[PDB]
Amino acid sequence: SNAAVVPMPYSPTTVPREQIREIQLQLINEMTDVHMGALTAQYMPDDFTFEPGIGQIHFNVETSRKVCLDLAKSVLRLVPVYPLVSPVKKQHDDYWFVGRLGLD
Amino acid sequence: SQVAIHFMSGAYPDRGYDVFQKYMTETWGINYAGVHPINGTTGSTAVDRACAVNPNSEVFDPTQSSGAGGLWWWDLEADKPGPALLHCVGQVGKLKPKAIIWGQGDQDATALAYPGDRNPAPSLTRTKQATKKVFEYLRSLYGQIPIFIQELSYAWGITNTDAPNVPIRTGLPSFLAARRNTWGDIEFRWKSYGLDPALAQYRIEIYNPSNLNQILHSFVVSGTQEANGYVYADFTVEDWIPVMMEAVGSPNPWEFMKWRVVCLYQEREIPSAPWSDNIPLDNAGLVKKTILVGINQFGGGHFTDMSDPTATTANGAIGRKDKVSASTLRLTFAEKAGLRPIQVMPVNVAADSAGMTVGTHKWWNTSSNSPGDALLAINDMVKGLGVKPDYFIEANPWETMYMKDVNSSTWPALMTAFESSNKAMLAWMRTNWGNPNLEIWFQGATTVWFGVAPPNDLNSEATVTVRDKQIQMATANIGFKLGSFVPGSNLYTAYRNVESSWIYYTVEAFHATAIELGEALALNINRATNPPDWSYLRPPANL
């Protein structure tokens, strides 16, 4: 029965984490130039790495790569084109190395 | 550390932030060194000082295991940059960042989970203020950085502390909870992690109250039992009275119970974390139909020392709920109706020598037309129950004894007053605590015997008149449908000697009446339409 299967086990810290997500959303809405980078509520215990003692508290490698891709896509969305500009715009062959006395 | 994972991994191509830098450089059409990520993250740091681990020493111990660590981004009292922000500024060195990636909040959640010891109480608004101060400080150092926020992930820890090397595996019964009726019965609920409960078997283990390590009782329930998306196992009173009997000398109400669930699947056992807390009381969730039975110690016998077969005394004392007649009543009602036995709850209401008008405890006051003292006392307790009462059972009235004692020709007046009081009471009960269509069910009348067995009948005519009035009331559609007559009540066998006075019933008579009442209540059967062979006959006219 699909009614009784639950994707994630019970943990006492789930509710405070939801409240912190809400408060961060409030900060995003009420502040300037603040955006959402990546969404990590999707990932399930199969993704995390188990450790002796405390277990399932840190990401795997693959999930880290996925989150980094999400962050890169978000940052590119904010800044589609390369902003910086360089005074030298041609190859070295075009320029002619000359020496001058003091300007004017 | 959730942000630190991108850096802590080894090797060149395999690291997390390498994908970030490669994507950004490829899209912008520049060489690989265009974007320069900087690591400012520190593991297990809290934005607020109070939420931080060991907020007493400002010494910086990022690696831990060397002493107390001072790990807070900001302190709201006497605003200072804080050690972690100083660490970030140091790691930046002499560079101008264009964007900031920010992700944090696991330690704050952990602090909010267990805030008892810390003198400043952790709160959400303090975390908001700390984060806003941190953002303002960083944007004060560098003018117009846009800030990107990473959402919090989930952390689970370890299920059972006894076995550290067991991960979260399939078929884990995680969500554990329990509740109980006003009656002693208890129900368990759990919810499986990966496996569907249908193709599984579960075992419940209950630990000893004196030695919390040892186990008293365990029973296996099939996984097909599901209600409202929850797997359930019913642990009724008849099951846990014998266990308490073996454990301790006398039956006692069971609270503060510790239990577990072990899932059985493909010859594998996957236990769950123990559950230890006081059992909450919730009638509304558990019970469907409520039965209020009896008045005047003749329906109250269904809960007291009379119906108990294993109890020596007979001075109207409370009996064991396992063997008393109400248990048989509930079991028959549930079996015939189709409900689970836990869903049906009988409720005891009674008074000593109570009657509608005649008795020393009057259930209705005719003078002022207002419920008597007994109903007033019963009302608060009945309203205390969350669920609405469904069936009210009227035992043998006390008017028979008064009629036989001090009445000769007053009987029709008593009958009229009894009928009027019953109708007024039914209307009042229907109005006050609701549940219209409530019906008062009846029970047969009682005769009095006196003598060495076989004894001599008394007040046969009084019981005949009372039974005739009850049958007349039940035949009418106003209500007051008659449940059942006592199977005996005319052959003097269903009575107790009690020093040559045969007023009350015996154990077997109580059980038989309970079974008949259960069958009558579960399936709507008005037995006044089919009276037995007797009760048609009348006493001989003249001697």
User: Over B168-205, what HEC string results?
Assistant: CCCCCECCCEEEECCCCCEEEEECECCCCHHHCEEEEE
Residue B464: Cβ-neighbour burial (10 angstroms; 0-12, 13-18, 19+): middle
A17/B contact by beta carbon, under 8 A: yes
- Chain A CB contacts of B155 below 8 Å: 11, 13, 56-57
- Tally of residues, chain A: 104
Spatial distance between the Cα atoms of B61 and A56, rounded to a whole number of angstroms: 24
Amino acid present at B175: F
- Chain A CB contacts of B231 below 8 Å: 4
Resolution in A: 3.2
Query: Quick one: closest CA in B to A63, which residue?
Result: B16
DSSP code at position B319: P
Residue B202 β-bridge partners: B221, B263
Solving technique for this entry?
Answer: cryo-EM
> Which of A1, A38, A68 has the CB atom closest to B198's CB atom?
A1
**Side-chain half-sphere exposure of B204, counting CA atoms within 13 A:** 24
Beta carbons within 10 angstroms of residue A89's beta carbon: 7
CA dihedral B17, B23, B26, B28 (to 10 degrees): -100
In sequence order, what are the residues at sequence separation of 6 or more whose Cβ sits closer than 8 angstroms to the Cβ of residue B42? B4, B62, B71, B84, B87
Distance to chain A for B338, nearest Cα, Å: 23
Spatial distance between the Cα atoms of B124 and A21, rounded to a whole number of angstroms: 11
Beta carbons within 10 angstroms of residue B380's beta carbon: 8
In sequence order, what are the residues at sequence separation of 6 or more whose Cβ sits closer than 8 angstroms to the Cβ of residue A13? B109, B110, B113, B155
Spatial distance between the Cα atoms of B63 and B163, rounded to a whole number of angstroms: 26
List % helix, strand, coil for chain A (3-state, nearest 5): 35, 5, 60
Query: Distance from CA of residue B360 to its chain's centroid?
Result: 38
* Strand pairing report for B46-48 and B72-74: parallel
Distance to chain B for A29, nearest Cα, Å: 12
H or E element that contains B147: strand B147-150
Spatial distance between the Cα atoms of B158 and A36, rounded to a whole number of angstroms: 30
Of B310, B343, B307, B180, give the one whose Cα is nearest residue B242: B310
- Chain B CB contacts of A38 below 8 Å: 150-151
B164·A41 Cβ contact <8 A: no
Spatial distance between the Cα atoms of B241 and B253, rounded to a whole number of angstroms: 9
Query: Quick one: closest CA in A to B199, which residue?
Result: A1
- Chain B CB contacts of A32 below 8 Å: none
A49/B contact by beta carbon, under 8 A: no
A72·B20 Cβ contact <8 A: yes
* Strand pairing report for B344-348 and B289-293: parallel
